[PDB]
Amino acid sequence: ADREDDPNFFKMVEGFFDRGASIVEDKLVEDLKTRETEEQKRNRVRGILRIIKPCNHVLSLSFPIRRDDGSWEVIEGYRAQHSQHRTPCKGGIRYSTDVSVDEVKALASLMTYKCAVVDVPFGGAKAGVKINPKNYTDNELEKITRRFTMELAKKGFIGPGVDVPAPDMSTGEREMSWIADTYASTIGHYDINAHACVTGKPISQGGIHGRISATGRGVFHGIENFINEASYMSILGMTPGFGDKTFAVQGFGNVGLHSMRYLHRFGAKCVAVGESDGSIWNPDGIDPKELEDFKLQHGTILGFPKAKIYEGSILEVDCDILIPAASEKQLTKSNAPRVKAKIIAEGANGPTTPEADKIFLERNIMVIPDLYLNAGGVTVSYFEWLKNLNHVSYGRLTFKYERDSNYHLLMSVQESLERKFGKHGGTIPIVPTAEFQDRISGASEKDIVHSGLAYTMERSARQIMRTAMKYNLGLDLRTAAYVNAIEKVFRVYNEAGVTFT
Amino acid sequence: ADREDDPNFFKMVEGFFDRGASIVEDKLVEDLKTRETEEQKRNRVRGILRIIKPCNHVLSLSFPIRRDDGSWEVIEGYRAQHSQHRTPCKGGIRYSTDVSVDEVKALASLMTYKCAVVDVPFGGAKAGVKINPKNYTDNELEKITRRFTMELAKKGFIGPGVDVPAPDMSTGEREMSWIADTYASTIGHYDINAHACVTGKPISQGGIHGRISATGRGVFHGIENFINEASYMSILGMTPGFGDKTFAVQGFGNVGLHSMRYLHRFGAKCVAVGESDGSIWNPDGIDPKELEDFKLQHGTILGFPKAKIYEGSILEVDCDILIPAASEKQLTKSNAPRVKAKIIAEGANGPTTPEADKIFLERNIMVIPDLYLNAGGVTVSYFEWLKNLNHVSYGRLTFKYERDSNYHLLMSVQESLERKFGKHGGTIPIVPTAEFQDRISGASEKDIVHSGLAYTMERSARQIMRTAMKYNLGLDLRTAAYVNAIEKVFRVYNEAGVTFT
Amino acid sequence: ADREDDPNFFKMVEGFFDRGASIVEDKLVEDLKTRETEEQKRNRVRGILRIIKPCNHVLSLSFPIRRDDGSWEVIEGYRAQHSQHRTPCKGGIRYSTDVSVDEVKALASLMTYKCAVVDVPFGGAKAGVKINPKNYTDNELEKITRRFTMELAKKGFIGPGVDVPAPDMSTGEREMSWIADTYASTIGHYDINAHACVTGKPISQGGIHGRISATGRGVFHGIENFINEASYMSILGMTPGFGDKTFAVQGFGNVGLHSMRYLHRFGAKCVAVGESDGSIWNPDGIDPKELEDFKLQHGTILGFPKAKIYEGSILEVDCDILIPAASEKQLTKSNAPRVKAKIIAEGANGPTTPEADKIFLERNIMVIPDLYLNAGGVTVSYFEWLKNLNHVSYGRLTFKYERDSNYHLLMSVQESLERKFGKHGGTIPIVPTAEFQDRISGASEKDIVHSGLAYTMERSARQIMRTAMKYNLGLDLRTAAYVNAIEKVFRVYNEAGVTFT
Numbered sequence A, B, C: 001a002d003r004e005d006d007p008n009f010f011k012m013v014e015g016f017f018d019r020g021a022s023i024v025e026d027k028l029v030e031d032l033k034t035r036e037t038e039e040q041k042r043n044r045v046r047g048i049l050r051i052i053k054p055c056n057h058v059l060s061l062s063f064p065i066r067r068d069d070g071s072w073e074v075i076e077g078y079r080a081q082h083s084q085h086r087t088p089c090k091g092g093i094r095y096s097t098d099v100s101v102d103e104v105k106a107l108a109s110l111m112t113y114k115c116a117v118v119d120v121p122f123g124g125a126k127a128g129v130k131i132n133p134k135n136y137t138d139n140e141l142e143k144i145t146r147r148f149t150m151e152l153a154k155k156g157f158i159g160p161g162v163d164v165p166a167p168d169m170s171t172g173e174r175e176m177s178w179i180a181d182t183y184a185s186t187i188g189h190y191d192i193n194a195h196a197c198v199t200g201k202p203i204s205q206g207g208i209h210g211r212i213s214a215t216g217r218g219v220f221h222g223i224e225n226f227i228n229e230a231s232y233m234s235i236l237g238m239t240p241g242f243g244d245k246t247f248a249v250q251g252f253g254n255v256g257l258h259s260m261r262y263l264h265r266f267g268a269k270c271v272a273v274g275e276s277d278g279s280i281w282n283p284d285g286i287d288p289k290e291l292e293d294f295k296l297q298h299g300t301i302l303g304f305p306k307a308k309i310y311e312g313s314i315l316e317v318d319c320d321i322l323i324p325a326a327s328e329k330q331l332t333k334s335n336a337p338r339v340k341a342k343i344i345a346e347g348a349n350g351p352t353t354p355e356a357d358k359i360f361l362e363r364n365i366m367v368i369p370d371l372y373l374n375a376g377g378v379t380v381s382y383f384e385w386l387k388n389l390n391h392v393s394y395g396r397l398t399f400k401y402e403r404d405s406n407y408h409l410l411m412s413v414q415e416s417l418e419r420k421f422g423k424h425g426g427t428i429p430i431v432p433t434a435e436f437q438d439r440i441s442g443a444s445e446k447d448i449v450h451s452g453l454a455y456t457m458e459r460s461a462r463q464i465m466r467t468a469m470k471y472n473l474g475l476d477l478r479t480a481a482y483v484n485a486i487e488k489v490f491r492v493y494n495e496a497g498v499t500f501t
Ligand SMILES: NC(=O)C1=CN([C@@H]2O[C@H](COP(=O)(O)OP(=O)(O)OC[C@H]3O[C@@H](n4cnc5c(N)ncnc54)[C@H](O)[C@@H]3O)[C@@H](O)[C@H]2O)C=CC1
Pocket: A092, A167, A168, A169, A170, A171, A215, A250, A251, A252, A253, A254, A255, A256, A274, A275, A276, A325, A326, A327, A328, A347, A348, A349, A374, A375, A377, A378
């Protein structure tokens, strides 16, 4: 998208890592309380850091499918497993003609660090199939997905205990259903956990409430934790809260649409929505329900009645918050000086080059990094995986017990008070509030997903802020996130003896 | 080695394939006895040929080893499995800093076509570890080999029934022994065929007589089959036989040395020997046993007392037969016009670019192609694999029975003659000749390897010659070999229904 | 059986090994082609020899059976796997109250060296169940055998690719049939080689012709090879051949009975037969079929009509050849001076202590050692295992072809002779001798077992004699055998890198 500043994607992520490694290297050496206090301490710390960076296993595939017209075609595919310091590996499947070994390796490493940031016990992985799904029938896409699943399974690149895929660009519920069905019907036929081989499944198939919207929901929570922190909003020259703010959204897919829904719900105003074919704009606000309904009907956002076909880059629209939610390397050395927003919330994976990060720093623009902000997807995938391993819906064993227990608890307060203020205090009814009445039976699956996600995004934001203050990083939240990720992954490699050697 | 003519190695091999595919496409379509004779027959033929060309599975590895000095290093590795129309896959392991995904994919496809040429029932595969072995201790090389084996085994890229490695550049007997030992001691502990997981083993560990020298022995047999056809020697302006010819050898490794031993044994004269550091030259002849003894003593060819340090390209030395036995892409557009030899016998894999083949054709230079000429290695690896599966040394069950049987057979002739020519004819002793006495017990392992190899190289040469005449290919033996390979591999894909789709 | 001289059985075998190790160390060090020509050479030779001696894996079992009367009883069992330099492991199952961990470890190591002596590609193993089979019903023995098989199988101590048992003291065809049936019906249900999990099976279940008598047949061949070498019979002061000699047999089981049958068949005369309850004696000779038919009828040897209940040790009976074919450590310090025989042929495993070997050497008594002499059992077990892996009876594919081929061969001689001695010489019939007519179709299973065994015993006797001359060992054949065994096993450990460490 830019021939001036177009770094190799894997190496760009390695650069981000190098930078966080630079900052913590002292802390790692000093923690290390080995008798070698000689600066082979320094040496073993940077030997371990070199082990963490490259992907351990990458599988490249070519397999034939026969198209609906009868033609034979060769499909190309890839899956990278970056780290196995936690198992299984976790990461999505991308259907796109931009798929390549380097793109997949880069996203696989992002998954490792992202999972470490939100304390999700998975190593990183990613897959890609180099096709444009719009050029294939549904029957052909099913054939490609099912065959890809078996080629991965034959070589140990999918399974509930090694590698658990998930949706990404141009895949969703539908593909995940296909993956889970052919895994469970063949190699997983005797495995009690066969349907935990993949997440993002439909509900009828072991999916979890809110997985489709989960990463949008997490984008809201990530922004909210920082947009409500007066210390960061001072440096930006902006007022805490959502009620008065504007935002623009690049990409109207699963991440972009649901980020818009939740931000709109809490008083922000969507001004611009950009897509693969063009952009639309309205300074008075775009309604997400109307835009979705139009998009579902016409297969495009152009021509939306209540906004005007906007020319020029969606990334340079004037707004408070820019949400790049499409592909990677969209903000570069070129357009970074014209961005006009004061908060960049990366919903997409790797939308900002390192050169663009430098410009944004100089310019007091806050980039909330992908490592943290889009990790709501993998957090709720983690909940889905646990739901599959546990083989019950949350609360089903305890709803009645817990309901009865709570009423007897409140009755214990009632009877204790009547016992004391006897006859002429009268009857002293203790009853639930409206809000407690609605929790009287304990959490359900929906409650766990919402509160578990909010808990994770908040706990992770505080850890990033703590680390940024400690090292005087200002608005370089990306380096603070990598610092936390590196510290966690380093400790695992260090206390494990590294490897089987 | 040449920046004028440096084609991508994988695509260069696909180019060779495309050529042979051109020539046979008609014969494939006409053979095809299917009800719908539309030249959409031609469409299925060219869909199948597109399926055959790319590698099905490629695994890329990164794993850490701790060096002898205590530092951590990250080792990079690769194994490509090109085709599974026959199983297991078969191919060597190369230790070299020139190793790359493309190099490994290219050699893996060469293995498929090579195996089809000599009727060896294996699909093609190849592996590479990106190190220079003369920078590592023996203890480090053992560590790297054993760990590489486990990483391949975990993902299904080594095993007696999927993929059976073998030596290549900078690996031999020693590494194969390490591979077999860690496979059999871990995931092969219950497998009756665990030691058939790799070939080129030492004899004490399941190796077969003559595997080290097998590919040199096959180079001799391949040359002999063509150097003794007067029709091809006419076109070259040359006398049949070896007794009178000179040759030069690029590379003094396992292929180069043994090619020189066998050619020297049958009256050819080695004039020049080139190496990674320099060449040596002597128009009176170099003796292989003194050269190897010098090489073993000094670790180099230079300074050999009975030849001179030759400057300028070994490939340009003046001789009848040039044997490139080092790495690939050594003969290019550049130096092809200065070659001076009349026969180029490719012992190495892919030593000649397609441009250089152009030039050699115009100038009536016969290139005996790698597909055919170096296939003695994989042929004797095949014998080793069968020896492992059978769990007896050849002849051990039958030596005594067979010898007793032969003497009673000769005695049947004796007694029949005496009965007829009674007393007046006397005693009529029927005894073995010296050469039959030597076979009186039947074949041993040594005999099977020697005669089985000779049988294969001759039968394959006659098939290549038959095909070159039938398509008027003259001295383009490479295209004739690919034609035979394609025909055989196409038949398997066609009658199998292609794939489970 | 003797308090004076009753060494620990495992260490006694280690003593034999140490003794052969002492003689070959120099040869091993000098062979060793390595740069550290230091006595770091002798150090690694000494370290490898220490690795070879102990057993790698020993499993000890306790499992309950409910007896026919309804009581519960706890059965004790053991299986030792001594070496895995060849796989699978091979060794018998002994039912005896004298079974112990040390006894089983000792016999397991004997199996390793024995297999190396006759070039049988198995590592050594042995099993024992500590019961007296005479105190159990057939139903109880079946339950014990089947349960023992499952306990071994669960832990990887039986299987066609790890460990293949066989009969020993108080087990035979019957028990092996039980073992094979429960293995193949449970854990081996999908294994193509399930019935190769054990040898010594009945013919109807994959057994091989002559396995029951095989170790007796090998005892005859082992004696033959030495009793016909005039150089050894000189030192003994006796006449080559069998026709004039006497022998006594301790133990009338599977080894003892069949040794007697074959020796009797070639003109030796059995004077004395000893068993667990007593011995019998007759200087005119005992006939083996009469004595077996009496034993089958009465369950004992005593009271045999044609011999006299002999008192005093069977081992001291006056004869030329003493065949101990019962348990171990029967010739000791004590009774070695009173032996009276000139040749001691150990059919049993470890019947002679090292002190008794000392005495026999001083008195010019030839001990043909167990390592060599009783290895006909494991040699024919090896043939049975191969028969199972091959899934055809020998010759079944080729009988008709070979018979037709031989007649056309003889007809080629006949027609060639007529077409030269025309009608001047008449018809010249070329026909098989009686002996060749018997072989006209090629070998059958019976022929391979007989000639394969004879071939093995005589090639092994040669190697022992060669090695005894070369080191001036005289009549210390035991040390010569261990020397050959050690050289072969050392080579494997050396060129394998020892272990994955
Ligand atoms: N799928 C998930 O749960 C998660 C996805 N992500 C990342 O979010 C990003 C996008 O989210 P997806 O779920 O893939 O959405 P999606 O694949 O459902 O839709 C992507 C949208 O972006 C549009 N698009 C593509 N290129 C564009 C361009 N140059 N300009 C404007 N629009 C463009 C497409 O037309 C489509 O509307 C990806 O980078 C993905 O890796 C991150 C975390 C979780």
